[PDB]
Structure 1
Amino acid sequence: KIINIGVLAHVDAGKTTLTESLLYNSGAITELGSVDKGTTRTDNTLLERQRGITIQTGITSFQWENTKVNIIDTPGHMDFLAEVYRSLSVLDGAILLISAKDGVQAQTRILFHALRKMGIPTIFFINKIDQNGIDLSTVYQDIKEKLSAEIVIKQKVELYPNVCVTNFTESEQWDTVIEGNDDLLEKYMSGKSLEALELEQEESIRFQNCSLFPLYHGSAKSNIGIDNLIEVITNKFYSSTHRGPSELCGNVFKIEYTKKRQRLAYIRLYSGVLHLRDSVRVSEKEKIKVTEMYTSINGELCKIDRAYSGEIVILQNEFLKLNSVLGDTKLLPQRKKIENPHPLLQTTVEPSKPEQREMLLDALLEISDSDPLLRYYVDSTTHEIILSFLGKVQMEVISALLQEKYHVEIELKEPTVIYMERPLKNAEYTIHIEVPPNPFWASIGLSVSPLPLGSGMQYESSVSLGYLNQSFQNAVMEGIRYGCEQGLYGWNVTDCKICFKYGLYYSPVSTPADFRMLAPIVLEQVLKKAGTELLEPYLSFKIYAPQEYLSRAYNDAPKYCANIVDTQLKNNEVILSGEIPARCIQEYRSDLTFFTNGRSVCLTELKGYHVTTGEPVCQPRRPNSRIDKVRYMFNKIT
């Protein structure tokens, strides 16, 4: 046989997981008919279990006295989207979900979209919760607009309430639809109709191509029609290669470890095996057996075979996620398409109490590994490395898991704006003469000149030209950037310059490293006149939102510390691409989605300091060291 890589998406609470566990029982019965739960083996991760929902993409694989296959169970809601995308970035076809009230959810839309551009050969809906107020007319109306998929055929309905019965039919309509696809069919349709078998092939070819697609309906709760559905889903949906017998080609699948008893690993074969050594980036694989996934639980395997498909319950270190198993066939599988899951919003993560720091450091490593997008990045202002999560939703769960394994507890907000304090206005002071230091005359002088916006100016020479004060202007740049940021208000040198000369030496006095100390001192005095330029935070924060919400979106933007620029309506939607200060990203992002329900989207940086418009109430954070320079400064102030 073969199988077929299929995932399961859709909004929250719409049966995604249960429907999954279902396909397991339906296509099996090797000792189970429904298996209690409530909770089971599919979602074995604590919390995921004790919690209720699956915050991590599952990974199932059922089979029958005919064939088998795997699966990937994504999580609903947001925040976790970044772990849902990773699953989708493998899987060819997506079993879209849709519960009763789930009348065209927010994710029911998107899943289907990605797949349409990726190549997903077929995407399949499954209305769940046909309990009450479960029309049939409503399902199709929603479908046709959203999924915008090609007008398929029917049917799948009959009876009402307790009298509800499974049905479908609609041959003529199907013929008509298929007609669009083939000229030959139309002619026959106009005069004849042909057969069904061949028409079934036309549809099946179109589904693997990423064009045609059919949807089956069959309730869910009472899980009746469940068992036919499972048969029918597996039917048209497998692979190729296999047939022959040779070469193993695969794509190391994710599946990170845990705390309790280390972890495992899984890869998919599409015409390969499992054993021997290995290859790829000079490195030995090391194996002690082949692989062979299994329904219930997954255990080692003696042997497998070519064109074999399953999961390997192993793999650990000396490797990593997304790993290409060299080779021959893996490079081609990389011609499907990506989705730069773009993680937009983010927050500040801070270690915590001393006791909590030991665990923190280890935590930050483990949370990063169990994530393919856990960009662990460290800031300069603090020795703490902020977390990179498409949202806190991930970060809640991330402190919950940790609270067990390693054990820790930190905070989750965003951070600081460096301050910059690169105002404009203008000022100039200098140059010393000698004192608590020891002239050491070195006159000095800095002609501060605000400027316009977007030039980072800087400078400058001065001078005399004779090595001296050369590397000295070096010391310059130094102390420069130095307070440039760290300082009174802790800014980041940006928009200013300087220049001077002198003087005295050829014996002693100490006119070397001392200059570096002096430089800062001079800048400080100019502070009183500086002000403490916030800077200018905005970018363009540019909001992509629907034509209907954008008016009210624009009234809310001025209240929300944002500016607006015009917004042209592009089709059914709009873009309302504007500027503003900088964030709060969170503030910016919340409101948009809020009065939009769930049908917002946005991103974009921009850069630029020109701003400062933020008053004060703060402006601080440093500083530095270096006896000399430091001793000198303190005296100077006196």
Structure 2
Amino acid sequence: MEQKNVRNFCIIAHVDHGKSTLADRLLEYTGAIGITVKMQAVRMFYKAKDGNTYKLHLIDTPGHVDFSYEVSRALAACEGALLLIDASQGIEAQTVANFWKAVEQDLVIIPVINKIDLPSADVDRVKKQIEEVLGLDPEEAILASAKEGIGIEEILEAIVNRIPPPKGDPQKPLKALIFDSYYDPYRGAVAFVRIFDGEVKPGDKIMLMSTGKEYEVTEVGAQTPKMTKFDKLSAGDVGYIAASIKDVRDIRIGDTITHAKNPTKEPVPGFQPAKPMVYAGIYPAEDTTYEELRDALEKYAINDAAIVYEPESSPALGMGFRVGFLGLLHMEIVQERLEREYGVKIITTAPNVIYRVKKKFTDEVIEVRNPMDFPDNAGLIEYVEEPFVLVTIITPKEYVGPIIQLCQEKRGIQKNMTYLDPNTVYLEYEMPLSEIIVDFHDKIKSISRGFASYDYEFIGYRPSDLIKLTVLINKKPVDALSFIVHADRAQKFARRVAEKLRETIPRQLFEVHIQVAKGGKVIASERIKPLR
């Protein structure tokens, strides 16, 4: 055979623990060394100690909770996972979250303790966490230093020896999982796939199972590390497929590729279309025009299958777009790329979640993605529901108090509390996503001096006493500033907002009066004295 000598794995680790550095050592070690494609579906050849040469496929994985779905699809493409832990940090929020996603996909997990070179490295501690928190055999852990290439070979041997080979039938109908993708100006929309059953080759007539759309394969291969064309990809392989595909939304992550003529029985399970959770209005800033902004968004969207947006207008700001993102990082990523890659200046509103509103006289509940569209008439509202998430937090004991007070301030309900070790606390909180996206990240970071980490997962919608607040400047209402808040938190948010603009607005002549109203009732006033 030969598929018996294949190894499909990924690296999962909390941000900064050394994922990239380690992947570099692996490629370097194995020899794997402008129309430049992101690292993905990298094929490597490794001659093990047992004398045999193995074909290893490194699947790159997202690291932020925003790309959780994408992360799970990549894990579904592997047989194993290298769980990288910083020896000087120990297990953190994403370490645990990823570990469980790996477990959920029945992956063989190889814990790798990185940064053993650091003076602050504490292996015995980390080994202790691995056993008590993860339930893994401390002795299975591999000690390494990706910075100094220490333990690389040991990792490659663990991959060969502990991770089982792919199991599929190349003679069966094609069945390939799409775990990633990107837009290639020449090849078109290309999908990075894991082949479970069958084979695929140029000229083949393929079909996407979620849509039933068909294409003719023009090229297949993998990164070696450069995009290299192969004659085919067979059961067990990881690579890419080009087939004159218009855009990345035609080859959605998690979808299944099969043959149009002889389609596989069922698609790989777990497909889910992209699901925006956080929206914000984006308007041109400075000299940048609406056209340039729209042009930039169109060009950007080509390479992003999750983003959505639609024209939006505000009296003050004018013409802009209501954009939906997977989360705060996704939003940040998009902003930086519009300004840095298309060089447009933008003004972004405070982000907001999607509310479900039930109004009298309207049978179906409405999804509100823009606060401006939240009904102005409170009496017409029967109820409002907002998304909630389960937040997991890991922090040194010393900061538990301030953190608990923060979560509670943000309407969090504690569900669990455990000790990862004598000085490390684990916390689980059910919190509204709307509270988490305002300033939770920086507050939790400053109070923990950056030592606390957190992760979260959507757990559903729940009714809440939410209301719409409007912001007025010189009796002039700025709909772009209207926002949704819980009735009990309204007063504080109002003050913060007013006090925020009191500084954000440039001191000038005519006194500017900032008011935050609650259905016509001013509940926060802030005015900046006229110049002179």
The Cα of 1:68 is off from its aligned counterpart by 0.8
Indicate whether 1:492 and 2:380 are aligned. Answer: no
Answer yes or no: is the 8 Å Cα contact 1:9–1:96 preserved in 2. Answer: yes
Give the whole-Å Cα distance in 1 for the aligned partners of 2:264 and 2:405: 51
Indicate whether 1:361 and 2:294 are aligned. Answer: yes
Deviations 1:48-67 (A, max 9, x none): xxxxxxxx663311124623
Matched residue, 1:598: 453
> Aligned partner of 1:371: which letter?
D
Answer yes or no: is the 8 Å Cα contact 1:27–1:231 preserved in 2. Answer: no
Question: Structure 1 pair 215/266, CA: closer, same or farther in 2 (3 Å)?
Answer: same
Indicate whether 1:587 and 2:439 are aligned. Answer: yes
1:130 to 116, 136, 161: 116
The Cα of 1:19 is off from its aligned counterpart by 1.3
Question: Structure 1 pair 132/69, CA: closer, same or farther in 2 (3 Å)?
Answer: closer
Answer yes or no: is the 8 Å Cα contact 2:175–2:257 preserved in 1. Answer: yes
Match of 1:385, SS?
Answer: strand
The Cα of 1:409 is off from its aligned counterpart by 3.0
Answer yes or no: is the 8 Å Cα contact 1:274–1:304 preserved in 2. Answer: yes
The Cα of 1:285 is off from its aligned counterpart by 1.6
Answer yes or no: is the 8 Å Cα contact 2:288–2:345 preserved in 1. Answer: no
The Cα of 1:324 is off from its aligned counterpart by 2.4
The Cα of 1:127 is off from its aligned counterpart by 1.3
Give the whole-Å Cα distance in 2 for the aligned partners of 1:375 and 1:135: 45
Answer yes or no: is the 8 Å Cα contact 2:416–2:428 preserved in 1. Answer: yes
Question: Structure 1 pair 592/404, CA: closer, same or farther in 2 (3 Å)?
Answer: closer
Give the whole-Å Cα distance in 1 for the aligned partners of 2:466 and 2:238: 57
Indicate whether 1:241 and 2:244 are aligned. Answer: no
1:298 to 212, 223, 227: 227
The Cα of 1:76 is off from its aligned counterpart by 4.3
Question: Structure 1 pair 58/594, CA: closer, same or farther in 2 (3 Å)?
Answer: farther
2:202 to 275, 279, 304: 275
The within-5 A match list for 1:106-505 is 106-116=93-103, 118-133=104-119, 134-149=121-136, 151=137, 154=139, 214-235=140-161, 236-242=163-169, 245=171, 247-257=173-183, 264-270=190-196, 271-280=198-207, 283-288=213-218, 291-293=220-222, 295-301=224-230, 303-304=231-232, 306-307=234-235, 309-312=237-240, 314-318=242-246, 319-322=250-253, 323-327=255-259, 332=266, 334-335=268-269, 337=270, 345-352=278-285, 355-376=288-309, 384-403=320-339, 406-414=342-350, 492-495=376-379
Deviates more, 1:227-236 or 1:373-382: 373-382
The Cα of 1:82 is off from its aligned counterpart by 6.6
Give the whole-Å Cα distance in 2 for the aligned partners of 1:542 and 1:248: 38
Give the whole-Å Cα distance in 2 for the aligned partners of 1:239 and 1:540: 38
Answer yes or no: is the 8 Å Cα contact 1:6–1:95 preserved in 2. Answer: yes
Deviates more, 1:138-147 or 1:594-603: 594-603
Match of 2:194, SS?
Answer: coil
Deviations 1:370-400 (A, max 9, x none): 3343243566868643333344433443344
Matched residue, 1:514: none
> Aligned partner of 1:321: which letter?
R
Question: Structure 1 pair 352/147, CA: closer, same or farther in 2 (3 Å)?
Answer: same
Aligned residues: percent identity? 18
Answer yes or no: is the 8 Å Cα contact 1:456–1:494 preserved in 2. Answer: no
Question: Structure 1 pair 350/91, CA: closer, same or farther in 2 (3 Å)?
Answer: farther
Give the whole-Å Cα distance in 2 for the aligned partners of 1:584 and 1:233: 38
> Aligned partner of 2:215: which letter?
K
Indicate whether 1:62 and 2:62 are aligned. Answer: no
The Cα of 1:131 is off from its aligned counterpart by 0.9
- Gapped runs of 5+ residues in structure 2? 48-52, 363-371, 420-425, 481-532
The Cα of 1:352 is off from its aligned counterpart by 4.3
> Aligned partner of 2:9: which letter?
G
Question: Structure 1 pair 231/333, CA: closer, same or farther in 2 (3 Å)?
Answer: farther
- How many residue pairs get aligned? The number is 432
TM-score by length of 2: 0.64
Question: Structure 1 pair 316/394, CA: closer, same or farther in 2 (3 Å)?
Answer: farther
Match of 1:103, SS?
Answer: coil
The structure carrying a bigger strand percent of its residues is 2
Question: Structure 1 pair 251/598, CA: closer, same or farther in 2 (3 Å)?
Answer: same
Give the whole-Å Cα distance in 1 for the aligned partners of 2:361 and 2:241: 59
Match of 2:282, SS?
Answer: strand
The Cα of 1:536 is off from its aligned counterpart by 9.8
Answer yes or no: is the 8 Å Cα contact 1:550–1:576 preserved in 2. Answer: no
Deviations 1:328-374 (A, max 9, x none): 78564623x57999765554323446744223223323444433432
The within-5 A match list for 1:93-104 is 93-104=80-91
Give the whole-Å Cα distance in 2 for the aligned partners of 1:540 and 1:615: 24
Question: Structure 1 pair 414/15, CA: closer, same or farther in 2 (3 Å)?
Answer: same
Question: Structure 1 pair 568/125, CA: closer, same or farther in 2 (3 Å)?
Answer: closer
Question: Structure 1 pair 112/316, CA: closer, same or farther in 2 (3 Å)?
Answer: farther
Give the whole-Å Cα distance in 2 for the aligned partners of 1:396 and 1:579: 21
Question: Structure 1 pair 614/104, CA: closer, same or farther in 2 (3 Å)?
Answer: same
Matched residue, 2:29: 26
The Cα of 1:491 is off from its aligned counterpart by 5.5
Deviations 1:400-453 (A, max 9, x none): 4344654433223326899xxxxxxxxxxxxxxxxxxxxxxxxxxxxxxxxxxx
Alpha-carbon RMSD across the aligned residues, in angstroms, is: 4.7
Indicate whether 1:12 and 2:30 are aligned. Answer: no
Give the whole-Å Cα distance in 2 for the aligned partners of 1:240 and 1:612: 55
Question: Structure 1 pair 593/247, CA: closer, same or farther in 2 (3 Å)?
Answer: same
Give the whole-Å Cα distance in 1 for the aligned partners of 2:432 and 2:340: 43
The Cα of 1:96 is off from its aligned counterpart by 1.2
> Aligned partner of 2:27: which letter?
Y
Match of 1:20, SS?
Answer: helix
The Cα of 1:593 is off from its aligned counterpart by 6.6
Match of 2:181, SS?
Answer: coil
> Aligned partner of 1:334: which letter?
V
> Aligned partner of 1:587: which letter?
D
Match of 1:5, SS?
Answer: strand
Matched residue, 1:475: none
The within-5 A match list for 1:534-545 is 544=391
Match of 1:114, SS?
Answer: helix
Deviates more, 1:376-385 or 1:99-108: 376-385
TM-score by length of 1: 0.55
Answer yes or no: is the 8 Å Cα contact 1:11–1:102 preserved in 2. Answer: no
Give the whole-Å Cα distance in 2 for the aligned partners of 1:399 and 1:61: 33
Answer yes or no: is the 8 Å Cα contact 2:7–2:54 preserved in 1. Answer: no
Give the whole-Å Cα distance in 2 for the aligned partners of 1:27 and 1:585: 42
Question: Structure 1 pair 591/557, CA: closer, same or farther in 2 (3 Å)?
Answer: same
Match of 2:228, SS?
Answer: coil
The Cα of 1:540 is off from its aligned counterpart by 8.9
Answer yes or no: is the 8 Å Cα contact 2:283–2:348 preserved in 1. Answer: yes
> Aligned partner of 1:18: which letter?
T
Deviations 1:79-132 (A, max 9, x none): 56675455345434221112332322332221101122x223211111122214
Matched residue, 1:524: none
